[PDB]
Design a protein around this ligand. Structure first.
Ligand SMILES: [Cl-]
Ligand SMILES: [Cl-]
Ligand SMILES: [Cl-]
Ligand SMILES: [Cl-]
Ligand SMILES: [Cl-]
Ligand SMILES: [Cl-]
Ligand SMILES: [Cl-]
Lengths: 188, 190, 189
């Protein structure tokens, strides 16, 4: 009965902060959503098996054991959903030097079974300027638009394989409060 | 041997009237296409199995049996396909308040086995202007939202093509040029 | 372990010629990639199978066996990968008169198991001027060409979701062809 919701967006789009604010407002109203990050959920599982001590060591792992941890992360999130509604911060695609890599390949969706995929969007201009303010980080607006394109294709495909609705929310400067209200609204 | 064709489009783009026009001129040539609406096939399937008596009572059934109605609906159209070519009027994605919902999830595709996905498009301007004319719109939103829906529909239709092998055909249904779109679809089916 | 790479692009973008330069420079560095054409793997598979003697007969076989040929092509390319890295030149989608046709439908991906899907792109203007120059083009517009680049993206991303292959876009721009090669050599590391 409890919902599984995935929140995605490119670095700098502000989707993590948006979800934290939404859960706070859902809790004023008595609706508990537990927030997790899919990637540290994978890191946690790999430490459980003695596979790592360091988080940089993750992307030096073989493609098989990395496919199994992905599976255990989704199943593990599937387990938390018996005890609370779950909101998962993850990438629709990771922009890697080798190309766009789906954050939820089919073997992860079959275990996770989301009810909603959220795509958090804004203009390339607003995204690139946020990045420059972040003292912890250079790529330009065309590469940012390309990524927001490929993220859309990946989430719609997730929707075709899982049955989740795919919801696009705009997170615009001066209007972050509007993004919260629509996301609260989606989940009620 | 018979073909199963899916025709898709956002509300107001005229794909239904395009389809009915194409079906009528094809029959003049000795080609039978039966036209069905995927949403009414789901209603009919849920009635036979005792699940409902009303077409509104369906969007209050649990998502599990509602997924089974979907699976059976795709199966029923492939059954109709032993007897005629079949054209299915359906949304590539339905734009719901909760987000875009795929009109043919994989479990439907596994039974439907479509041969062609047609995406009927035009400019968001014409779509909004057609919609405003319809006094049967109090639930129809801006052109940027219309452009977004035609985007997601393309991504969903190509995924159907990747998972089924159906070719995905884009037809432009423009004001003053409706007759050209019909003729291009007739050509697609010949 | 050897990697299998799919290289894609609309006609006239130069994805084929980009690959011949890259495989040629990779070997100077001691890295062997074998280049194959997915459609010629299919033709060769069917010739053993008594199904054809002529490429004329291929686009006239029944749709069950021609899916079966598709699958055996994916398997056979996956077999070549036991002995060397394999680079597969194919269409992410084929623009046919009936619409866009995926070049790696799901049943092929399950057998081919690519590691990288590469999309070669440039402006529709550059693509269209190349096409007119080629006297080996036997008519379509810049809008039709961009629509094809759009669907190829939707398909290629779909491959990554189903397989875990990375989807990489390389721009192959006029006056900057040598720049595109360097990016692809880099991809192959
Ligand atoms: Cl995004
Ligand atoms: Cl604000
Ligand atoms: Cl559409
Ligand atoms: Cl309509
Ligand atoms: Cl007209
Ligand atoms: Cl090519
Ligand atoms: Cl070329």
């Amino acid at each position: 009965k409890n919902k599984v919701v995935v929140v995605t967006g490119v670095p700098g789009v502000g989707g993590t902060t948006l979800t934290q604010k939404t859960i706070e407002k859902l809790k004023e109203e008595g609706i508990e959503y537990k927030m997790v990050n899919f990637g540290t959920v994978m890191f946690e599982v790999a430490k459980e098996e003695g596979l790592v001590e360091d988080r940089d060591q993750m992307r030096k792992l073989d493609p098989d054991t990395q496919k199994r941890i992905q599976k255990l992360a989704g199943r593990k999130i599937a387990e938390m959903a018996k005890e609370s509604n779950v909101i998962v911060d993850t990438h629709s695609t990771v922009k890697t030097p080798k190309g766009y890599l789906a954050g939820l390949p089919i073997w992860v969706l079959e275990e996770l079974n989301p009810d909603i995929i959220v795509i958090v969007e804004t203009s390339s201009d607003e995204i690139l300027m946020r990045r420059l303010g972040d003292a912890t980080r250079i790529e330009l607006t065309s590469d940012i638009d390309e990524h927001q394109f490929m993220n859309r294709c990946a989430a719609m495909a997730y929707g075709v394989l899982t049955g989740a609705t795919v919801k696009i929310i705009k997170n615009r400067d001066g209007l972050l409060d509007k993004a919260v209200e629509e996301l609260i609204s989606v989940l009620k």
